[PDB]
């Protein structure tokens, strides 16, 4: 539908789920996939295996765009931080840049109270 040949992948990893989106440099999404959308429900949803499965599926879904170069920005502390980038590289892209862009307050707002479990 269009040829961009170079985009960036956003990985949003948390303790419950990982979400991978692919966009061009200007920041317009082209396709996305999730660990929970790949048939992994519950505890199985929060494992590196599901993260790399989601990475492969998201790479497959964006096939029509002819991506050849790719940057990666990863945010969040989730378990799926390293399997996803490995699976993304193995799919045939060239990881030309890796960045951690997780947010950190410079004080900020008051976090929720502690769980008494």
């Amino acid at each position: 539908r269009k040829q961009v040949s170079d985009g960036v992948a956003h990985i949003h990893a948390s303790f419950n789920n990982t979400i991978v989106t692919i966009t061009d440099r200007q920041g317009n999404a082209l396709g996305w996939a999730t660990a929970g959308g790949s048939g992994f429900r519950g505890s199985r949803k929060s494992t590196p295996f599901a993260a790399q499965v989601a990475a492969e599926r998201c790479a497959d879904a964006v096939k029509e765009y002819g991506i050849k170069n790719l940057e990666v920005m990863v945010k969040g502390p989730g378990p799926g931080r390293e399997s996803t980038i490995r699976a993304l590289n193995a799919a045939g892209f060239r990881i030309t840049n890796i960045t951690d862009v997780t947010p950190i307050p410079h004080x900020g707002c008051r976090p929720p109270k502690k769980r008494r479990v």
Partner: protein, 55 residues
């Protein structure tokens, strides 16, 4: 933690460099430390406890 891959090095060395850069940056430590609110009294308590245990 900004890692720009150089010329012809493999992916594994760049990934290891990025992991090391994120480890020395204290990213996950800060993220875990800001997850819940810890009272000032608890802060001082555990800081002093760490200090005395070290000594």
């Amino acid at each position: 933690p900004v890692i720009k891959v150089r010329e012809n090095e493999p992916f594994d060395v760049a990934l290891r460099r990025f992991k090391r850069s994120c480890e020395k940056a204290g990213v996950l430590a800060e993220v875990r430390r800001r997850e819940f609110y810890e009272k000032p009294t608890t802060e001082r308590k555990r800081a002093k406890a760490s200090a005395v245990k070290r000594h």
